[PDB]
Amino acid sequence: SMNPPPPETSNPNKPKRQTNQLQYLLRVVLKTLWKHQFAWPFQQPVDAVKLNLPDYYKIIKTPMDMGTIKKRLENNYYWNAQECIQDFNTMFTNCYIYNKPGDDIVLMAEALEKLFLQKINELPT
Ligand SMILES: Cc1noc(C)c1-c1ccc2c(c1)nc(CCc1ccccc1)n2CCN1CCOCC1
Numbered sequence: 001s002m003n004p005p006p007p008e009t010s011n012p013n014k015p016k017r018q019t020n021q022l023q024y025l026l027r028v029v030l031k032t033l034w035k036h037q038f039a040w041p042f043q044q045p046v047d048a049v050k051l052n053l054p055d056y057y058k059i060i061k062t063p064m065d066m067g068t069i070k071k072r073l074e075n076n077y078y079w080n081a082q083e084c085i086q087d088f089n090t091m092f093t094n095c096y097i098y099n100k101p102g103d104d105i106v107l108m109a110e111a112l113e114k115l116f117l118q119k120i121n122e123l124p125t
């Protein structure tokens, strides 16, 4: 089979707000990870057709990526900062579920996760 539609990035039924935390998550946390040497494979949904991963969406039923997170931030999709942190954790955990220890892509996820945790540590109050 092919790819699912990507995660929703807009909900017109959801109220919106801007906050110091949500702004930092886009401008500091997401920007930093995005510009990292290992970011590209995480900048859009996993495309199982192009990567030839016919079991990807059999194993992964809650896909997430930084392209989606970026759009969710830009669209003010997130009301709670926790929702965004969750999405970043889902993204890493997926990489660890599907792939094997020591795989290039696992090593890249580990580095991005380490940096994420360094940046989240400085979330403003
Ligand atoms: C994340 C993730 N979780 O599970 C897998 C598998 C990946 C994964 C794992 C690896 C990923 C990748 C995603 N995206 C790319 C680069 C973008 C791309 C390139 C070609 C076709 C579609 C997208 N790569 C690198 C793919 N190249 C293929 C050619 O050999 C070197 C690596």
Ligand SMILES: [K+]
Residues within 6 Å of the ligand: 014, 015, 016
């Ligand atoms: K509103």
